[PDB]
Amino acid sequence: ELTEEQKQEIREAFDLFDADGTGTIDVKELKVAMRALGFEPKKEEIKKMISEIDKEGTGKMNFGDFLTVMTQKMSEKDTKEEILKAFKLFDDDETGKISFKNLKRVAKELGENLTDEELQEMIDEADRDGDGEVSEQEFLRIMKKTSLY
Amino acid sequence: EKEKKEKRALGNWKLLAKGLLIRERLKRRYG
Amino acid sequence: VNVLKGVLIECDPAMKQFLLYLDESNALGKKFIIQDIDDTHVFVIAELVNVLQERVGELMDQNAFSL
Amino acid sequence: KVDEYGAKDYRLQMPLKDDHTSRPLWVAPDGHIFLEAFSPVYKYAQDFLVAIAEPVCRPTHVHEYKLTAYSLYAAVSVGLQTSDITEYLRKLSKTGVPDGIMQFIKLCTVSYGKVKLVLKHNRYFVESCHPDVIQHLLQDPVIRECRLRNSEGEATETVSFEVKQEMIEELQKRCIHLEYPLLAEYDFRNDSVNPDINIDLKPTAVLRPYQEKSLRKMFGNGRARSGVIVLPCGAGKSLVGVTAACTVRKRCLVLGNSAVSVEQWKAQFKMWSTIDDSQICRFTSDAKDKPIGCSVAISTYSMLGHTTKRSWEAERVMEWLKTQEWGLMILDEVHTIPAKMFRRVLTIVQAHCKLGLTATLVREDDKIVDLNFLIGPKLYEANWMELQNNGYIAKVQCAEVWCPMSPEFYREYVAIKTKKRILLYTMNPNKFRACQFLIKFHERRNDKIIVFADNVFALKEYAIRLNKPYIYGPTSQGERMQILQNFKHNPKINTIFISKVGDTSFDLPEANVLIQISSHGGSRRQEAQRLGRVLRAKKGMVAEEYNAFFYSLVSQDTQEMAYSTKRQRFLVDQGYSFKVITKLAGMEEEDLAFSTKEEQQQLLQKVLAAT
Numbered sequence A: 001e002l003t004e005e006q007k008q009e010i011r012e013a014f015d016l017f018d019a020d021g022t023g024t025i026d027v028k029e030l031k032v033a034m035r036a037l038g039f040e041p042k043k044e045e046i047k048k049m050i051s052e053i054d055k056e057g058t059g060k061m062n063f064g065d066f067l068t069v070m071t072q073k074m075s076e077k078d079t080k081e082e083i084l085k086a087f088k089l090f091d092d093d094e095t096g097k098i099s100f101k102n103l104k105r106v107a108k109e110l111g112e113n114l115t116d117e118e119l120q121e122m123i124d125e126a127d128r129d130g131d132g133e134v135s136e137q138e139f140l141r142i143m144k145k146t147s148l149y
Numbered sequence B: 001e002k003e004k005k006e007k008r009a010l011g012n013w014k015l016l017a018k019g020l021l022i023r024e025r026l027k028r029r030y031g
Numbered sequence C: 001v002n003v004l005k006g007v008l009i010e011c012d013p014a015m016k017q018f019l020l021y022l023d024e025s026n027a028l029g030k031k032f033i034i035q036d037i038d039d040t041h042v043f044v045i046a047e048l049v050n051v052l053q054e055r056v057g058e059l060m061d062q063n064a065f066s067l
Numbered sequence D: 001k002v003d004e005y006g007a008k009d010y011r012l013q014m015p016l017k018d019d020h021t022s023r024p025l026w027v028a029p030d031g032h033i034f035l036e037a038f039s040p041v042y043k044y045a046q047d048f049l050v051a052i053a054e055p056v057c058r059p060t061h062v063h064e065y066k067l068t069a070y071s072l073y074a075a076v077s078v079g080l081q082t083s084d085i086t087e088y089l090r091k092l093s094k095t096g097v098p099d100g101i102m103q104f105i106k107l108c109t110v111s112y113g114k115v116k117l118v119l120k121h122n123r124y125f126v127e128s129c130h131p132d133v134i135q136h137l138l139q140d141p142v143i144r145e146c147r148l149r150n151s152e153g154e155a156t157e158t159v160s161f162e163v164k165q166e167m168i169e170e171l172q173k174r175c176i177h178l179e180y181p182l183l184a185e186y187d188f189r190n191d192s193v194n195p196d197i198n199i200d201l202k203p204t205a206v207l208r209p210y211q212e213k214s215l216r217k218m219f220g221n222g223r224a225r226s227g228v229i230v231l232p233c234g235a236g237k238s239l240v241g242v243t244a245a246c247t248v249r250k251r252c253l254v255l256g257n258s259a260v261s262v263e264q265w266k267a268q269f270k271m272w273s274t275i276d277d278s279q280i281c282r283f284t285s286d287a288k289d290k291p292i293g294c295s296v297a298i299s300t301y302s303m304l305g306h307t308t309k310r311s312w313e314a315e316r317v318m319e320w321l322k323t324q325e326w327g328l329m330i331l332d333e334v335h336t337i338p339a340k341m342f343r344r345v346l347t348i349v350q351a352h353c354k355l356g357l358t359a360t361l362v363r364e365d366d367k368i369v370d371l372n373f374l375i376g377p378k379l380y381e382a383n384w385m386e387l388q389n390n391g392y393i394a395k396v397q398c399a400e401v402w403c404p405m406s407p408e409f410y411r412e413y414v415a416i417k418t419k420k421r422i423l424l425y426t427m428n429p430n431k432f433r434a435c436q437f438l439i440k441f442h443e444r445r446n447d448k449i450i451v452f453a454d455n456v457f458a459l460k461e462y463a464i465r466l467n468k469p470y471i472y473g474p475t476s477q478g479e480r481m482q483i484l485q486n487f488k489h490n491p492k493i494n495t496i497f498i499s500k501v502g503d504t505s506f507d508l509p510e511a512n513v514l515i516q517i518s519s520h521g522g523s524r525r526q527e528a529q530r531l532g533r534v535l536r537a538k539k540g541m542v543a544e545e546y547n548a549f550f551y552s553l554v555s556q557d558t559q560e561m562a563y564s565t566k567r568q569r570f571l572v573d574q575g576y577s578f579k580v581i582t583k584l585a586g587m588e589e590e591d592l593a594f595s596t597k598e599e600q601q602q603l604l605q606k607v608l609a610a611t
């Protein structure tokens, strides 16, 4: 089970660009269709998804693949929202980053015996820009490569 | 060894995340 | 007004939680457990309650063995 | 023919005779036999059925036995012919014996011991007095492949013929298909290749009547015969094996489950045999001894099952063992044998007389039919209730305790559908409270408390919160024996928590209170064997029918219930009863853990943290 009524919105969005009745819609109009359902990806994500959708260079996506892409986008969006909520739980001081203080506070509240050296080891292994902590995007990325969620 | 310690850090991240998830879920269950 | 005449069910807390799971998870399908009432009592339409007990019949069946 | 109620209408085929109350046996044409214990001829019928039939169920009053081709082979090789068996059956049967059962017995007995297998000069020969049988059997392709091939690939020529060493068990299975089972008989007194050994029986050795009966049944007409003898743990089964080895007095090889089993076997041999310690060696990786001059070599299956390269000395000892031919081989924990690696050990080793001893013989994978020819027929199986009456073992008080599920825990348990549900019900707060109350009550009674928990995490949490010693996978052997001696000697500490390693990985000191929290999940023989090994005969309360206490904690409305009824079924086959104890008297007054649910929800947090 994925969706019950949200599929109708995706069908409407596809049919808006499928007014010619060819069964497929143009890849270039993919951004508008996402904006037809509220999705607002950046240019990099649009290029990445066009590359995956149009590997064979057809330039069109059918109903099934469009529905699958929309479902994947919705799942990733709600996962991102939950990850943001987790970040806020960690960043209860609203610093924009899960600093070492935030991680230590969460660990002590969690009651785990995770050593401060291990906390900073995780921070650095989750630190990419070298700012000395973990940012929103860094936490998002490490969750994306997370073992399971 | 490098990948083992990296996976250890990832597993610690996952355990902490799941623990916070369960804490929030049970708090919502009773508050 | 809005007051419902149906069938109430009274059971132990374990069966209460089992019915809660049945309603939420939609294992029965349609949410025919519209709303509970009390800490050990629930209120359901008599349309599905029979089949509801059917599920309970399987439950205590699965917590047993066949000879 | 079947009745509308489903019962089999065997009345037509059973001519009932007027000697009803006098004769105790019912012989249904299905092959099953029923006996009444209240009959005055119970003992005679008991011995007759044990000799001829394999017991199935032995409750208080009426027992059911079964007839199998292996049972009939055992009866024939004991020395009983068809006419005597038929006469005794008809003298004890309430009704006439159906002609189908008669014909089945005739067909089985007419060909038993026909084919003979001889291990001489480290070579296996198949011979018999009926050359037509052998010649006709040559047409079997499996027999063709099993037969030893010459250096050119040609077949080797009461004349016998050599058979390939690797293809023994293949021949074993094949002969059954050939309806001509082989004979596992040894020249006990006619032996000349292997001389005897300066080993005898110490005067301190005592043979209880069932032990002596089983040994003598094994020694059919004074010749040792391969087979399996089932005795409860601590009933002198190790002593029985030692006595058999002393009787044989030939070269002896013993295989145990673990190192502790090897140590116990060596101690028992020293405790009752006159063999000098120079001739006793342990083929283990820790205590290494020279195999030369080792009259009785004790090892484990793994030490012989090592497909991987061993140590260099181990290779030499294995070469010595393979070269040497053993008059006697002893296998303990026979139920583990049907595994493929351990089965290959039998092919590896060349021995004349192989005897198996264990506490149970019901492998949950039903790989027992092959064992009937891996070793041989089941020689003996003592009646557990009868031994209880004689006081040879404790009269156990069995009980199953149902524990209610916390609503949050039960909702989570229903939510999960995969194998991950094990943690939730094994960590039931009510189950924890029940275990704590039982431990408190029995410590106040000054009882030996041993608590089993197959789940690693549950065992750790339970033992730590209760602050009691715990033994699991690591089990540092020195500290393991330290904990064991603390339980044995220190009265302050009499509560030991043991993981799955308590089955056969070490020695269990005799106890009186055994509390089982988590089990394998249907291993009807494993945990029954654990119960048998844990609880031993204790002086002081022999007169009472309940001198040993066993509790099995099961979570209500979980799948665990379905396991327990599935498991204790085996113990039901021995007449043991389990009274359901939904509620424990006295828990209210005594303060226990998790009195508040706020603690319990933290416990739920902890459990769900580990998924």
Ligand SMILES: [Ca+2]
Pocket: A090, A091, A092, A093, A094, A095, A096, A097, A098, A099, A102
């Ligand atoms: Ca912060």
Ligand SMILES: [Ca+2]
Pocket: A127, A128, A129, A130, A131, A133, A134, A135, A136, A138
């Ligand atoms: Ca950062």
